């Protein structure tokens, strides 16, 4: 909004080199389209060859989720390092991830296929870790990724 026009015009052939490059550094464009105004065109990070961190939205979502998990699992500092605390922590994390799944952020047919949480002696921890006072939690998540390219094919119908 409140825009007249961009200072330069970018073509598709230039966009090919802006969007994909062997060094992974990517440049998102702002282009004008007839009748639609000026629009943002491109949603990649500076690590565009990374299979995990290619897109902006995935990284921002991960940041949000880990921040919420940290804030949720802060109150247990200086609590007994035993099975009951582990149960409570796992419950909190799973409830948060379930709320995220049901809004359409995560893929999967049930919450069993969308995420998993591992915390315990036979999962991520040992006796040495109990003596040290360390708690280790492992969280896996499947996120949804966008479609960038649409290909149309035309033909003459047999008659």
């Amino acid at each position: 909004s409140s825009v007249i026009k961009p200072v330069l015009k970018i073509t598709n052939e230039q966009q090919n080199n802006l969007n994909v490059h062997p060094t992974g550094k990517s440049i998102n464009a702002i282009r004008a389209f007839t009748g639609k105004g000026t629009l943002i065109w491109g949603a990649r990070t500076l690590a565009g060859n990374d299979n995990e961190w290619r897109y902006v939205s995935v990284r921002r979502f991960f940041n949000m989720a880990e921040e919420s998990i940290k804030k949720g699992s802060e109150p247990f500092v200086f609590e007994p390092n035993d099975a009951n605390t582990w149960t409570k922590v796992k419950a909190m994390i799973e409830n948060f991830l379930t709320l995220q799944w049901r809004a359409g952020a995560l893929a999967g047919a049930k919450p069993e296929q969308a995420f998993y949480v591992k915390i315990g002696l036979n999962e991520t921890m040992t006796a040495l870790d109990i003596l040290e006072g360390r708690m280790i939690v492992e969280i896996g998540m499947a996120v949804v990724r966008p479609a960038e390219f649409i290909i149309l094919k035309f033909s003459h119908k047999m008659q």
Partner: protein, 142 residues
């Protein structure tokens, strides 16, 4: 592991200050049945298939102590349609106090609070009750 378990040694995490509850009831799950039959079926009774799910409210009872006003505290955090929701955890313990069966409740807020009744001839302790609504329940055993 070989013996059946008793039902008198448990604990409840409810984001409240104190612990030591007397009664906890209401832990159920259900699915509705849908029925169907067409005219030419050789059997003269219906076919059945699953429908929607249903969950119950949970009731908890505990004794009254001086200085503890937590049920009321939680109930009284209610604005027009907003309230403070909490994650609830219920666990059954065995002789060596190890959590064996765990019930995880999702998004629970208190719908009702009942105080004790007063009797000039009553030789009993005063007990209070709370009733809670939620949007989910999950069972974990072993």
């Amino acid at each position: 592991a070989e013996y059946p378990l008793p039902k008198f040694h448990f604990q409840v995490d409810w984001g409240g200050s104190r612990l030591g509850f007397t009664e906890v009831s209401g832990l159920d799950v259900e699915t509705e049945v849908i029925e169907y039959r067409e005219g030419n079926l050789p059997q003269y009774h219906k076919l059945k298939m699953p429908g929607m799910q249903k969950f119950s409210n949970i009731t908890m009872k505990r004794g009254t102590f001086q200085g503890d006003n937590d049920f009321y505290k939680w109930w009284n955090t209610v604005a027009l349609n907003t309230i403070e929701r909490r994650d609830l955890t219920i666990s059954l313990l065995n002789e060596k106090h190890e959590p064996v069966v765990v019930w995880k409740v999702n998004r629970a807020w208190p719908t009702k609070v009942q105080s004790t009744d007063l009797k000039g001839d009553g030789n009993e302790v005063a007990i209070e009750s709370i009733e809670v609504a939620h949007e989910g329940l999950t069972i974990q055993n072993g």
